[PDB]
């Protein structure tokens, strides 16, 4: 059949479910949308199903499918994400908010029929109940970042890191250091990549027809770092 990159040549429906626990506050979110790796384009709509989100939406953009990055033709031998499909991969993360708590994430990105599913479990701790996160002091926006990928030799996967800049209502900036591990689920061979990065851009929107607390996320991601 089709396997690996063959499965991303067109539009692919996406499903995102997440269970969270931040400083005891407990919530769930569901998301739907689609991704097109031909353009590196990603579109998702998220809804807090347990009422309302105890944290700011922008902090969970990262946690909410890098298999939809547009890996230009001359780099296709470094697309670890697509190479692990359809079986899938695990995505573990630890996010450090400077002078504030931290997120711990574990997720499974894999195909389940006709849909790419990213199911996550998040746990936050050590946050300041008056700080920028739990104080809902974050501007509802997102900037552009470089995601740095590196082959994890000890495992059979990759190590990834980057720093997010969440803008603050007072005009300052809160840095969120990201440290990320990916390892495949199947036993089939994957692509271990040379050092490279993904150019990420994100824009958060709002559906005016939407009554619940929600986020509309659009993402453009293109890989870079090698020379022909």
């Amino acid at each position: 059949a089709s396997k690996g990159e063959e499965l991303f040549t067109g539009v692919v429906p996406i499903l995102v479910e997440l269970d969270g626990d931040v400083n005891g506050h407990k919530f769930s979110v569901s998301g739907e949308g689609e991704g097109d790796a031909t353009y590196g384009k990603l579109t998702l709509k998220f809804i807090c199903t347990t009422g309302k989100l105890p944290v700011p939406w922008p902090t969970l953009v990262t946690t909410f499918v890098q298999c939809f990055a547009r890996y230009p033709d001359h780099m296709k031998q470094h697309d670890f994400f697509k190479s692990a499909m359809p079986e899938g991969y695990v995505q573990e993360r630890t996010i450090f908010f400077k002078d504030d708590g931290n997120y711990k994430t574990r997720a499974e990105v894999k195909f389940e029929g006709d849909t790419l599913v990213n199911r996550i479990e998040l746990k936050g701790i050590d946050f300041k109940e008056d700080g920028n996160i739990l104080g809902h002091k974050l501007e509802y926006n997102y900037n552009s970042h470089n995601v740095y990928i590196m082959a994890d030799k000890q495992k059979n996967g990759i190590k990834v890191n980057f720093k997010i800049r969440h803008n603050i209502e007072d005009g300052s900036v809160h840095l969120a250091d990201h440290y990320q591990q990916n390892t495949p689920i199947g036993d089939g061979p994957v692509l271990l990549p040379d050092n490279h990065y993904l150019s990420t851009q994100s824009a958060l929107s709002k559906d005016p027809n939407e009554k619940r607390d929600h986020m509309v996320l659009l993402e453009f991601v293109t890989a870079a770092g090698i020379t022909h």
Partner: nanobody
Amino acid sequence: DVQLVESGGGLVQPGGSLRLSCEASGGAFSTVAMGWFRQAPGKEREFVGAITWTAGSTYYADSAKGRFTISRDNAKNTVHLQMNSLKPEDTAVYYCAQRVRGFFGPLRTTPSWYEYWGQGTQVTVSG
């Protein structure tokens, strides 16, 4: 490692009903689909039914549609196969099977598809 514990087989007079149950415990990865197979002594493994964990769409064998009813429990990593209008030739050992990898396409019914197998549970129909 991971283990699948079957339960709820048994002995029933024809026309009756029996409920097999299987619970996946442990394991590094989350369930994607669960199925039931059956084999009689000196005969060949048969697919009975299955269910996708996220979508919840059921798939039955020809000999089972209408009579058998497969379902989940609160996504509690537990699956149930309710059999109604049982019969003598339905006698066999019933195996629960689990698929934790991802897949693209329809749920397939071949044993290789399923990674993790239970030890089997005895279902006997007699007068």
